[PDB]
A and B are shown apart, each in its own frame.
Chain A
Amino acid sequence: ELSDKESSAAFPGFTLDHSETVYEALVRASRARGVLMTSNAAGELVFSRAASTATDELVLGENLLTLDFEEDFRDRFSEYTVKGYARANGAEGDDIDAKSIVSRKGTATDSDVTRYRPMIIIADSK
């Protein structure tokens, strides 16, 4: 369903661990792509897209029997930094140097948490 230009970027190489379920393989790929995988109402697989227009209203006075609002900050961090290994199998092996093979990095910062609170993530693939 997505019409992105970067979510459709092809994998330079994607291998399958043996005895891996289809769910495991597709979740592994979708996590790296940023997409979320879901099931349709007719049994299909869907790579869903979040909605854009507000269609309904829920209010406390008219049409609510019970509400529950939990706001916990035991997991949200400030700086997520992901580190991993570069691509060197084959064609890129004649181009990439030795140091940049191992030195890769990426960062995403949150502004809701005000103290230090970092987190480092080992990547999943190349």
Chain B
Amino acid sequence: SPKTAELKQAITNAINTMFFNEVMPGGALAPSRIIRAVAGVTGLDDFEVRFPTEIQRSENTELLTAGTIEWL
């Protein structure tokens, strides 16, 4: 809801560290973890995660990585 540079940077860093912590090759990612990471910012008013509503999966040789986040 607030579109400011420091909020975008904080959300990006939160997502990056959430990927760093509990993302390993051959793992499963749900929208729950991303929503939790975004909510744990204490600098927002309203938000909603829309795209990765489905469970993301990959094999052993593949590793999940956060790409380019749109709108922020």
Would A and B touch once assembled, by the CB under 8 A criterion? no
Please give the residue numbers on chain B whose beta carbons come within 8 Å of chain A beta carbons, in ascending order: none
